[PDB]
Design a protein around this ligand. Structure first.
Ligand SMILES: CCCCCCCC
Lengths: 341, 20
């Protein structure tokens, strides 16, 4: 009965997605229409800025990618994927893409602004989340992957730096830079060291299962306050990852340790989320016995924490970055490559 | 403690993605 409503929901969702997937939105705004306020963050190929839309007065977060840099780092296909996918999705815990456009030097993606800041900031500050608090977040991730996976989508970049906290205390997943639509196996080496599944590190060809392993890492990190595999140099991390040995802090409940040992299962064929019951083995786990998935989806649950917002356009919850002026060349750069954007 | 070990490690800040 509950399972059937989901299946239906999902079904209808696949239809809406396909419609956008086949005919993507394009050139919906222009740089001239916004005022650049402040850099909210930094990533590997571009930056994110707080911006204000002259005409409506709303603030948004604008992601900026430099065409040539994208090109030098071989991220063209990834960048087209990111945009094409973001424009097609629709789920309560995903950042909404508002506008997209390009110019001689860059690519722009404008989304709703999520003022609460990165989960990363708070976690590091607090040090660690109480189990129920972490379970609350994890729940949202579960449903999100449930949605995304059903669309043949693989996320590949889960980590607290990618989860923003909204006004209501809920999570918003951002950065679809490695998101891919694939029926079958994939082989690219991408992600964040601490969160990489062994198969990825082992160059074995992987599927949706890497997302579940990552969800395991995230939950451990939220509750312990440190990831399960840490070191100073990536190579050492990968070695610990591959090795298949996990230690848990004395404070984890027996339930949690059980969930975790099943998510952090080196053998894909035994890893929760990648079995006959698929997502159900997770949702059904004793650790989540308390969670009303529906209510979470509905956002009827009281968030355990609510970040402080002092006004629209308030950046208080974000770290400070050095400002770099955006420069638009007189010559069109890499036109061919980004035709579809 | 492990936490203390993490705190002193070089990877307490924001972690960038790898691609290559
Ligand atoms: C009306 C409740 C539908 C449940 C949503 C399922 C999320 C994958």
């Amino acid at each position: 009965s509950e399972q059937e409503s989901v299946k239906e929901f999902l079904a209808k969702a696949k239809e809406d997605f396909l419609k956008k997937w086949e005919t993507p939105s394009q050139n919906t705004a222009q740089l001239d229409q916004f005022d650049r306020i402040k850099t909210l963050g930094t990533g590997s190929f571009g930056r994110v800025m707080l911006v204000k839309h002259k005409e409506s007065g709303n603030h948004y977060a604008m992601k900026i990618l430099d065409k040539q840099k994208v090109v030098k780092l071989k991220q063209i296909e990834h960048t087209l994927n990111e945009k094409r996918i973001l424009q097609a999705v629709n789920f309560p815990f995903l950042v909404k893409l508002e506008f997209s456009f390009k110019d001689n030097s860059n690519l722009y993606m404008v989304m709703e602004y999520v003022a609460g800041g990165e989960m990363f900031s708070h976690l590091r500050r607090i040090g660690r989340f109480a189990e129920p608090h972490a379970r609350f977040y994890a729940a949202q991730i579960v449903l999100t992957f449930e949605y995304l996976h059903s669309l043949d989508l693989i996320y590949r970049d889960l980590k607290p730096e990618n989860l923003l906290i909204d006004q209501q205390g809920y999570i918003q997943v951002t950065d679809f830079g490695f998101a891919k639509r694939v029926k079958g196996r994939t082989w690219t080496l991408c992600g964040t060291p601490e969160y990489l599944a062994p198969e990825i590190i082992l160059s074995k060809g992987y599927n949706k299962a890497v997302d579940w392993w990552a969800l395991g890492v995230l939950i451990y990190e939220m509750a312990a306050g440190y990831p399960p595999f840490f070191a100073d140099q990536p190579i050492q991390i990968y070695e610990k990852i591959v090795s298949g040995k996990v230690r848990f802090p004395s404070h984890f409940s027996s339930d949690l340790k059980d969930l975790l040992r099943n998510l952090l299962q080196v053998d894909l064929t035994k890893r929760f989320g990648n079995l006959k019951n698929g997502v159900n083995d997770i949702k059904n786990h004793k650790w989540f016995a308390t969670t009303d998935w529906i209510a979470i989806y509905q956002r009827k649950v009281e968030a355990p924490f609510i970040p402080k917002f002092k006004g629209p356009g308030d950046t208080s919850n974000f770290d400070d970055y050095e400002e770099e002026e955006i420069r638009v060349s007189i010559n069109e750069k890499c036109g061919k490559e980004f035709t579809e954007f | 403690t492990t936490y203390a070990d993490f705190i002193a490690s070089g990877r307490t800040g924001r972690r960038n993605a790898i691609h290559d």
